[PDB]
Amino acid sequence: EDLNFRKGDAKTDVFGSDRMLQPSPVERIPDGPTTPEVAYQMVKDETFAQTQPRLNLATFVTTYMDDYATKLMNEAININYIDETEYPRIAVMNGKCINIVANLWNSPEKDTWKTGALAIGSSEACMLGGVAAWLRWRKKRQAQGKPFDKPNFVISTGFQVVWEKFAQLWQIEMREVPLTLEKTTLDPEEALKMCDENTICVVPIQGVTWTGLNDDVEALDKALDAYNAKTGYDIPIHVDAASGGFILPFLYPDTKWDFRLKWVLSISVSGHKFGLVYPGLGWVCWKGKEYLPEEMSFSVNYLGANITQVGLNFSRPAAQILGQYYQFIRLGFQGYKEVQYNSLQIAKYIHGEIAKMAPFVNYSENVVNPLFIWYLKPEYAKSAKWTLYDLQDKLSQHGWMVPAYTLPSKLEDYVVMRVVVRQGFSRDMADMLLGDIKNAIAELEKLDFPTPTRMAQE
Amino acid sequence: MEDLNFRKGDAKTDVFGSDRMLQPSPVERIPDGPTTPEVAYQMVKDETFAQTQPRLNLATFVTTYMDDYATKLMNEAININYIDETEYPRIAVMNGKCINIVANLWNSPEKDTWKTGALAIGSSEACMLGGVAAWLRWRKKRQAQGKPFDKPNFVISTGFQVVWEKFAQLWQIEMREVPLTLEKTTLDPEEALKMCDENTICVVPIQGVTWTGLNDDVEALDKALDAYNAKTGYDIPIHVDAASGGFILPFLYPDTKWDFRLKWVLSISVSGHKFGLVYPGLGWVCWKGKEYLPEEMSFSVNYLGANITQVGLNFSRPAAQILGQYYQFIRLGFQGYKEVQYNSLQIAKYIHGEIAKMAPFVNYSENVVNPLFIWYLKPEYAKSAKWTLYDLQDKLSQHGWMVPAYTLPSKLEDYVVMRVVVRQGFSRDMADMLLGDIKNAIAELEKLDFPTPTRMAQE
Amino acid sequence: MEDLNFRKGDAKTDVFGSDRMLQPSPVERIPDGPTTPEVAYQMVKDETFAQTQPRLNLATFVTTYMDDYATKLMNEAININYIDETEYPRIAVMNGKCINIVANLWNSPEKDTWKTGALAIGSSEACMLGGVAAWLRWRKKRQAQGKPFDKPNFVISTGFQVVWEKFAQLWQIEMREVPLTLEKTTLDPEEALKMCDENTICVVPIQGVTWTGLNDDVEALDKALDAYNAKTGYDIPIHVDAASGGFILPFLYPDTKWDFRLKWVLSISVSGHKFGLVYPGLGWVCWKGKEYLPEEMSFSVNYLGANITQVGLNFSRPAAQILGQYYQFIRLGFQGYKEVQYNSLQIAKYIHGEIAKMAPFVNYSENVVNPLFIWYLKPEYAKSAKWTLYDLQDKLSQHGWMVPAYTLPSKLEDYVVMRVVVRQGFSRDMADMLLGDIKNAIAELEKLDFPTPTRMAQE
Amino acid sequence: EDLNFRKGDAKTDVFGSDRMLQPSPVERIPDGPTTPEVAYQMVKDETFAQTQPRLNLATFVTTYMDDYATKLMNEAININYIDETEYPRIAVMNGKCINIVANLWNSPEKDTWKTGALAIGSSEACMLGGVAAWLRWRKKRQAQGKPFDKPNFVISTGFQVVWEKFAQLWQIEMREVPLTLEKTTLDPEEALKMCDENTICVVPIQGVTWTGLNDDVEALDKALDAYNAKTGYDIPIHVDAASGGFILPFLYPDTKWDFRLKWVLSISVSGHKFGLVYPGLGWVCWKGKEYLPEEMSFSVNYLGANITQVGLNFSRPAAQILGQYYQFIRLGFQGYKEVQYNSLQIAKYIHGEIAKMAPFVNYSENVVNPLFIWYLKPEYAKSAKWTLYDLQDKLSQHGWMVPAYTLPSKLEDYVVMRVVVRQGFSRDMADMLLGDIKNAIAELEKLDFPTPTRMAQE
Ligand SMILES: *Cc1c(COP(=O)(O)O)cnc(C)c1O
Ligand SMILES: *Cc1c(COP(=O)(O)O)cnc(C)c1O
Ligand SMILES: *Cc1c(COP(=O)(O)O)cnc(C)c1O
Ligand SMILES: *Cc1c(COP(=O)(O)O)cnc(C)c1O
Ligand SMILES: O=C(O)CCCC(=O)O
Ligand SMILES: O=C(O)CCCC(=O)O
Ligand SMILES: O=C(O)CCCC(=O)O
Ligand SMILES: O=C(O)CCCC(=O)O
């Protein structure tokens, strides 16, 4: 007999111990330790009762990489990127990723080491782009003797929340262009009507989270050029290309959306979205060194590489840099093209199967990113007992997360549902999703009474 | 017999018999085409060999070792995006539980079950959130008083970590710096108060100053600030930058009054990936109460009955560091944290005392309160020495160590110092290897007949 | 809920919160008592961190990389004792097949299916077996002729590897050395013959001289020895020390007559753990035929139809390397070996040519025939330089490399040279990293206003 | 259809390929490559049809280490010990192992860094000990003006073959002292009768491979002291403690066999036997630096450690050094004592169960190493139709290797069987062995006719 079996000794079975008869700590650190096996199960077992990542169809963020990328990143778990003097090869590798991304966006910058910065995601990358735009504008107005205490920026109502965070945490006024059925993306004329002497930039979006579409950056550039020539306000573009920045160079190389455009001075992207790297990666590039203010930034030479030192974060995992460089070499341009081709084709397939179903109609006929949205046909929705919120709940019962939500301003009456196709979501998994949707439709159509969300829409 | 595509990357290719491994890695542009995973894996991996090994990086404060079970747990969470809280509500609750545990480690008087605080990637984000909040609370007060609010400043030691300079740059807030001297090796509150005025948004004492390893005396600052605030009505608060010290003091110095026990400490930040014992990617910031976190910055969403504050500079991010932090709280508990930090501090104190015995060296402080310390050359020894600590740094790097030498901040910029940080996973046996290499390096440098370049640069 | 024995090593102990990790590792005496495996694992593992990583060790000729399948196969054989041939007869046969394959790579004319040869731990044991065999054949021939046989000698370049000095010392056999000059950068046959007499047991040309990377011309020696032997009747044979070149020449230089194609080459040795591409612990020695391996040294036992020679200095030993060798033969074949060695030699030639373009350097040879080469400072640059190749070695060590600087053997002792060995797993990309580090080290060393200790020691 | 499926492409199944219809190469390197999976199987599959290491009861060499030792050694597979400038911490660790072994043997040497050498096994360690003994004798005889060209050494007929290799490869005369049932180990007086002015050393054995016994080193030391004072020949002892060198210090600390004895000037041992490390480890220690000739050796200071550079091998795996240092720290003295206690207890147990069986009688009543030998009772053997060779074959049918062999000279008529108990052979496995032996006896006792080996004994 083992006296200390239940107390956590060498013979203890995790699930015959006192600790596994006790709740996990909510408020205070436990007074004492447990065995690693007990602690591992206590933390791990709490993650079972939620969405499995590969079935999370709400997220744009990578939920699969191959075995070699995963191994490489796991092996780098203890590498702090910011220790660049200690790890100068990763600092150089970061600079090469930035060069590769800037050249993917057709940067005209002649310096070997392109002007850009590592980020944890598009959040930090967007804020860096916006702060730079803010500082360039402050300096311009100061030289002109104009006031500089009431800046604004212009964006679609389809903005992702980081631009609201940017507005709040820096106290810069956000001016929003509404969406309508006639203008499903940023309309340049309406955007221009909100520009004045205090606008620091206009922010078109490539891969709008709410809709899956792309704002027309070239059309914005065109309108902005004539306006800037009229007023001298010199208003630039920052492209929020969180998803599209790793779609368009491979699948739409001739679409002029990037540094080929005169007024596109900076671009940001989520490397952890369609850059195909696990969470923790964004990039922001400037068209040239002259668009990155000295007040924000400096550069350090590491092994002959000029590495720009700008960022909101400091210490951070380096794994995602290795992961990014791995994807660039392992796939190359052709490999990225074929992976994004697969993701886009599966999205268009699901899009076309959704359109064949009696309850549904797609927001757009054109799928330009590996995602799309649909809603209930208005005449179907009128007499239906259910809403898309009910469909989301039905699908979650099979482990899927397929989100239903209302669109931004002037389309707030439209409840839509979104599917994001990422690498690792196959045609076979699409068929399973489509079968579950068909079954959910059949069950919901048996309702004799309206659901609560159906009643709330009345 | 012969395999036609052996060199081009087929199923029979040997990585190092291939054309790709006769070619340089891409510097400017994505390669046109793919390679095999094995080739690409080696191309990226092999570039990380020629640099400091993490366990021998003694410059860094950030965790380079966790146990096998924490490591496995975090690797298994590599594809989990924290910010997908609706999809992963159990991790959102776990995040709120870590914040509670941290706030209570800091003796928060907040009565709400779900404490006011936020996840961060490191003390960089956590400090900026603390500073933006102090700035917004100050703007609101001055606006309500009819006073100007366009020229904010904050007060901090010259021993600040660079994120406070970034904060000053990226928000255009004036940083006022209190210099270090040998008479005042940490932030002196009276000199701190001399830089306070109606435009001061907060004072930032530091627990675990990166340059020196010391702690600013937060309680002494709180006392001076209390009298000053009673005199002026400016209501200047404290944000404690406890990047390292926030996970040392609760366990090793429970009676040092530095945290939410003090009247004017309204927020505190810490690096979970330093002495919180989690691999890179974790910080925490807590507020003394919900009233100190402006609604302009923040909201909260209920996930499975837990009120989780949605404030942050980042959005999508790895969730593994939350599982790792919660694992350490459960696996070690208070006693286990105390015993690990005791080990790290004892080893730092051991090296500190061994350093003091060697003829060329003298310690900046006799008090080791965090698992790190700094030393410099005895002035009388340095005058006739042919070498500097930069030469010692280079000697040690030849054996794989990174032991950094650098000049101290303002009014001590003449002092070249060297720093050793003891982290979990750096043992007494490894300290003996370091000390042996230091002794051997000293004996080699003492044979020099001519001064080194850095020695001449000091002349 | 405190754990009383947490620091003493129970089921809850954290390695780096334990008393054991506050104590030094044992230097003199076995510790009195046990620890947990996790603690002991770290204590041993952590001592290996502070040294050169194998893939950046450019001094070594010995394999530092094999693919994942070879590595898995060898790890799985860690508990297999080769010498237990009755218990493990398939490995004994596998060893015999490896010996057959090596003998045929060297164009053995031996008609027996099972070639006469022996497993070794490296070229050290393989060379000693070859030399003892030559010594015994010589003793027997001199005895039958009624001549003395008590003062044997052998002839070799001053570029010998240290095993031949051990052979000379441990068997008390006189080693006669032919010096190197710039005019005779490898073994000159005429000078070698002038050191032969009636007591010379063999001449040892070297394929892959460690000091230089060059090949002694075996065919020229064989030709010279043939005429010498016809004149004197001394009947002196060749043993080829082909430690590196024995797995280079068959694939990249098939037409160079250096092996058993030559009349007087009676035995050849090689390091299987060098360019045979197997992890440490493998060498081979083959004889031209059974009549050249004395029965006094040897016997043969039949295992499963395989005639296995039982010759060796070692007895019990790891079997993993046999599996590793046979795997490489099957996995790569002739073509795969050819392409791997081609990559290594091409990268060595690439580094060789880039070094020649740098102002301080000049290469020892314009011919690169093994995946390694040496260079030194241009005499005119060296006169006024403040630094030596020893200073460059130390600088490159600061980035984790080991690139050795050393003086050449006799009559070239004045030459300080530096050597790079390119092994499987050293790519073009890693070469670019090395060359970049060299360029940077030169620019730093060129800033010196005073000479270094080694530069002064050169007077 | 996949055109290249059988030829080795990415879709090839190893056992649907042409290569797995072809024999493995016997004579010549294949002209071309295969896939790693095919090559892995081809080599691996050849190792199945032989004794499994844990059931190999012939071997004295370690067949089990724990998971941490095993992982530690695997991780060092690419580490060449001899690169001591590159790997100076392993050179220091090697020196610490030599110190620990030297003190385990009660070395009186005052130096911190004990005089000793790493080996691949007892073979190299014994040859180093014998070469040193040989060189010291040459120097002594030369200084006296005496001849030194006809060396000999004295050893039991129970020598292990390396001493024959030493005799052959160095051309030194081996003088053998026979075993008898009256003198089951080396008799000192018989040993002394073969010594003269040309004897370089006497070699007692601790853990004789043939018998499991220990030569009485202390009795040899006493007799050698009186002989040396009479003749002045100054003949020393080298102890071949291949097995016993890691048994006696823990289980028989009071037995005086090591450097405590005046004439024991060197001792060798197999670290890969009862030192508990996987194949590839030996040690030799000298009583002091004056007993290791400089002609054989030099010393290099690595990080303050004086490391002796003597050895027959050069480049070699360093993994075994880590494994040895791991075992010293992981087990300590107590842990070694308890592990060797277990192995010895199990051997004593099997020994006692063998003695109870009608056909058998043990060679010795005292088990002093974890091994022993037995033979057939003389009267049982006379009428039995089977021999121990037949028992060996029967046990091989169940996967065991339990060897039968004739003892060396003057016991050449004795066919014996040996069992070696190593770490990893438990009481439970001993019961399994004993059950198979019992079953085998019942089968062989049914023979109506004698076996080939039984007739060969007639
Ligand atoms: C992803 C997203 C963001 C926020 O990016 P993160 O990578 O989550 O930090 C901003 N804008 C758009 C269009 C996005 O899709
Ligand atoms: C670590 C550090 C910081 C920055 O924190 P990160 O975790 O690197 O983001 C700020 N202040 C101090 C005192 C620090 O030690
Ligand atoms: C490698 C080497 C040796 C010694 O061989 P090991 O494999 O280290 O035992 C002998 N001669 C030459 C030319 C060598 O390169
Ligand atoms: C093991 C053995 C040897 C040979 O030792 P290895 O470790 O196989 O090289 C020599 N003598 C005895 C008594 C042995 O048991
Ligand atoms: O992809 C995600 O998980 C979040 C980023 C986009 C969004 O806000 O929905
Ligand atoms: O610990 C690190 O690796 C960086 C922390 C902040 C600093 O030291 O400036
Ligand atoms: O390659 C090695 O690691 C040793 C080889 C022999 C030598 O260089 O002397
Ligand atoms: O134990 C072995 O595997 C061989 C050891 C030497 C022997 O007993 O012959």
Side-chain angles (χ1 to χ4, degrees), chain D residues 171-209:
Chain D
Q171 293 296 291
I172 298 169
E173 174 180 88
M174 163 183 293
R175 297 180 175 181
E176 307 183 23
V177 179
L179 296 170
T180 69
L181 287 194
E182 301 87 77
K183 292 169 179 56
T184 55
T185 58
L186 178 70
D187 173 70
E189 295 297 325
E190 293 177 356
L192 267 304
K193 287 183 308 194
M194 319 199 62
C195 295
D196 59 24
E197 198 160 16
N198 297 314
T199 301
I200 68 174
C201 64
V202 187
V203 184
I205 304 158
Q206 306 297 259
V208 178
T209 55

Side-chain angles (χ1 to χ4, degrees), chain C residues 122-124 161 163 206 208 210 241 243 271 273-274, chain D residues 314-315:
Chain C
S123 275
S124 188
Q161 205 273 347
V163 57
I206 303 157
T210 70
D241 182 352
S271 300
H273 58 210
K274 283 185 181 180
Chain D
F314 198 67
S315 294

Side-chain angles (χ1 to χ4, degrees), chain A residues 235-250:
Chain A
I235 299 169
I237 291 167
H238 176 89
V239 183
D240 179 351
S243 287
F246 277 114
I247 300 296
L248 294 152
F250 307 107

Side-chain angles (χ1 to χ4, degrees), chain C residues 61-62 121-127 159-164 206-210 241-244 269-274 282-283, chain D residues 80 82 312-316:
Chain C
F61 300 67
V62 172
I121 278 289
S123 275
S124 188
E125 173 180 22
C127 282
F160 67 79
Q161 205 273 347
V162 72
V163 57
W164 291 103
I206 303 157
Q207 306 299 261
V209 178
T210 70
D241 182 352
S244 289
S269 52
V270 73
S271 300
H273 58 210
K274 283 185 181 180
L282 187 59
Chain D
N80 180 10
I82 206 62
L312 306 184
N313 299 294
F314 198 67
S315 294
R316 58 151 291 161

Side-chain angles (χ1 to χ4, degrees), chain B residues 61 123 207-208 241-248 270-271 274-275 370 372:
Chain B
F61 296 67
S123 278
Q207 305 297 258
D241 180 351
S244 287
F247 278 112
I248 301 298
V270 74
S271 301
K274 283 185 181 180
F275 290 94
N370 296 286
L372 64 137

Side-chain angles (χ1 to χ4, degrees), chain B residues 7 47 335 339 343 429, chain C residues 3 7 25 47 343 429:
Chain B
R7 303 192 53 85
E47 292 194 3
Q335 177 195 7
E339 299 308 339
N343 267 38
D429 187 50
Chain C
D3 179 54
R7 304 193 54 86
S25 59
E47 293 195 3
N343 268 37
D429 187 49

Side-chain angles (χ1 to χ4, degrees), chain B residues 2-4 6-7 11-19 21-25 42-43 46-51 53 55-56 65 67 328 331-332 335-336 339-340 342-344 346-347 394-395 397-401 424-430 432-433 437 447-451 453 456, chain C residues 2-4 6-7 11-19 21-25 42-43 46-51 53 55-56 65 67 328 331-332 335-336 339-340 342-344 346-347 394-395 397-401 424-430 432-433 437 447-451 453 456:
Chain B
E2 197 102 342
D3 177 55
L4 177 74
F6 183 86
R7 303 192 53 85
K12 295 174 190 180
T13 297
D14 183 284
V15 172
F16 298 104
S18 72
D19 290 330
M21 283 308 186
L22 296 187
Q23 296 160 358
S25 60
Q42 288 293 323
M43 183 163 288
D46 299 348
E47 292 194 3
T48 70
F49 296 158
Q51 44 181 30
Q53 302 194 18
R55 305 276 296 269
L56 307 181
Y65 165 92
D67 70 29
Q328 292 300 124
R331 185 262 177 282
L332 298 175
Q335 177 195 7
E339 299 308 339
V340 171
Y342 175 83
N343 267 38
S344 296
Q346 283 297 290
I347 293 161
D394 291 342
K395 288 282 170 274
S397 73
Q398 296 170 201
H399 295 279
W401 303 103
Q424 181 183 27
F426 190 91
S427 65
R428 157 69 181 267
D429 187 50
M430 298 172 71
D432 287 338
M433 325 181 23
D437 286 351
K447 295 169 183 183
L448 292 170
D449 290 323
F450 292 106
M456 303 186 291
Chain C
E2 267 186 320
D3 179 54
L4 179 75
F6 182 90
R7 304 193 54 86
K12 293 174 190 181
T13 298
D14 182 287
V15 171
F16 300 104
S18 71
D19 292 331
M21 281 307 186
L22 296 190
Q23 297 163 358
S25 59
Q42 289 294 326
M43 182 164 288
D46 300 349
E47 293 195 3
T48 73
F49 293 159
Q51 44 182 30
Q53 299 193 17
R55 305 274 296 270
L56 306 182
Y65 164 95
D67 72 25
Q328 290 297 123
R331 185 262 177 283
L332 298 175
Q335 177 195 9
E339 301 309 342
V340 170
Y342 176 84
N343 268 37
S344 298
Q346 282 295 290
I347 292 164
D394 296 345
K395 285 279 173 270
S397 288
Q398 296 171 13
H399 292 275
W401 305 104
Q424 181 185 28
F426 190 93
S427 65
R428 157 70 182 268
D429 187 49
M430 299 173 70
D432 287 339
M433 180 160 15
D437 286 350
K447 293 170 183 183
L448 293 169
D449 288 324
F450 293 107
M456 304 184 21

